[PDB]
Amino acid sequence: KVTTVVATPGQGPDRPQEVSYTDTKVIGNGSFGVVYQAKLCDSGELVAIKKVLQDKRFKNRELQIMRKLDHCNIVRLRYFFYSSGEKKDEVYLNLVLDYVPETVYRVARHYSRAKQTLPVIYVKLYMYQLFRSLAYIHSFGICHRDIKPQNLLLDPDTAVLKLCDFGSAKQLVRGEPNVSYICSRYYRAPELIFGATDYTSSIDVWSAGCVLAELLLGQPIFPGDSGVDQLVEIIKVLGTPTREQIREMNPNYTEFKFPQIKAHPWTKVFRPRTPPEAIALCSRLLEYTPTARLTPLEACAHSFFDELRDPNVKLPNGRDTPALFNFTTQELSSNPPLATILIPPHARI
Amino acid sequence: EPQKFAEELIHRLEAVQ
Numbered sequence: 370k371v372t373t374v375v376a377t378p379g380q381g382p383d384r385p386q387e388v389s390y391t392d393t394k395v396i397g398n399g400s401f402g403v404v405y406q407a408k409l410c411d412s413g414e415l416v417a418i419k420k421v422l423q424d425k426r427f428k429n430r431e432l433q434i435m436r437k438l439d440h441c442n443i444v445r446l447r448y449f450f451y452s453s454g455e456k457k458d459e460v461y462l463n464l465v466l467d468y469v470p471e472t473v474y475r476v477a478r479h480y481s482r483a484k485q486t487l488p489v490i491y492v493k494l495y496m497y498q499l500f501r502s503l504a505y506i507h508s509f510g511i512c513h514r515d516i517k518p519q520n521l522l523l524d525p526d527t528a529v530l531k532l533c534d535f536g537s538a539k540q541l542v543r544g545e546p547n548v549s550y551i552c553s554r555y556y557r558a559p560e561l562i563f564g565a566t567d568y569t570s571s572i573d574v575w576s577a578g579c580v581l582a583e584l585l586l587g588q589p590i591f592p593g594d595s596g597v598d599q600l601v602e603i604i605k606v607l608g609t610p611t612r613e614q615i616r617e618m619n620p621n622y623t624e625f626k627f628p629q630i631k632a633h634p635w636t637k638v639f640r641p642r643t644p645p646e647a648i649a650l651c652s653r654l655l656e657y658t659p660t661a662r663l664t665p666l667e668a669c670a671h672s673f674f675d676e677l678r679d680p681n682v683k684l685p686n687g688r689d690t691p692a693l694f695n696f697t698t699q700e701l702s703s704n705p706p707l708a709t710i711l712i713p714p715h716a717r718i
Numbered sequence: 719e720p721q722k723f724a725e726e727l728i729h730r731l732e733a734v735q
């Protein structure tokens with residue numbers, strides 16, 4: 370069963386071309402609409418296809434964002450095309466994406482079930498690549514807002530990571546309201562829980578820290594049932610936020626009772642073998658004040674990732690590391706002098 | 719909303735200590 374459609378290149382010239390695919394299999398449910406796997410007849414390559422319902426009366430936000438993005442650490446929009454069906458009367462937007470075989474969730478769950486933690490070398494590789502993608506999208510003012518282990522795709526052999534699913538992504542601008550009920554509770558920034566409409570891209574950074582901690586711990590650091598229990602889990606570790614911190618999150622909560630609760634030491638949080646720099650990175654990712662959190666680019670330059678900038682560093686399978694040093698001007702636009710650290714001498718010329 | 723939410727939050731902290 371072979372399907373032939375007229376598709377438009379994702380970031381391309383905007384000249385539609387005929388594309389044929391086959392072997393349609395369901396991968397799972399994306400943010401909005403389900404995700405299929407398929408094989409391009411021409412190349413033989415595997416792709417992911419997220420079919421979403423499109424309303425003819427307005428433009429698709431995800432599509433607008435996706436056509437801007439080209440990055441090694443982000444799942445790329447190969448093509449897009451339209452189709453109809455499902456009671457008809459409407460049109461579906463089909464996003465043809467890179468196919469990637471694995472997720473951090475599946476890998477983390479694979480180690481946790483064996484009562485083990487992911488080797489620090491993978492934690493370094495995966496987190497660094499996530500921060501790069503974050504640094505890239507935030508430079509367009511674009512906030513992913515879905516950051517979580519399930520949306521972190523992996524190639525197990527090459528150890529390449531790719532951020533995926535921008536169905537919740539928004540381009541943020543000063544003076545506009547945004548839904549405070551967003552992300553996923555375990556990875557939801559505290560200001561979001563306070564119902565702050567004014568939040569920035571720093572919320573993705575918070576989520577990243579939650580992922581980092583989870584990979585160190587072996588479980589989500591901030592569990593719990595209600596959205597209000599989420600805040601309880603956070604203060605059980607970070608301690609009751611100061612008045613000045615509440616102000617920086619949601620000013621509408623500045624004066625309130627809020628019983629003082631001692632912060633649980635970061636070193637007592639993780640297992641005794643946990644690297645010091647891993648703990649320092651995590652502590653600078655998770656802060657009540659969003660402005661106090663590291664920028665993704667700053668995170669990349671953190672001492673925790675110094676092992677990746679070693680000329681002799683290799684994967685546990687003997688293969689070379691993926692390209693970590695390939696930063697463009699757009700990636701570095703937030704802090705160009707950081708390249709002095711980010712791009713090691715051995716990768717300069 | 720703000721005073722309402724802070725009241726069910728402050729309660730669950732009296733329960734944690």
Ligand SMILES: N#Cc1sc2nc(N)c(C#N)c(-c3ccccc3Cl)c2c1N
Pocket residue numbers: 396397398399400404417419444466468469470471472519520522533534535536
């Ligand atoms: N937009 C978009 C894409 S492309 C893609 N590709 C994948 N291989 C996987 C996986 N697993 C996913 C995925 C991730 C989290 C939850 C559900 C799904 Cl289907 C996606 C996904 N959401």
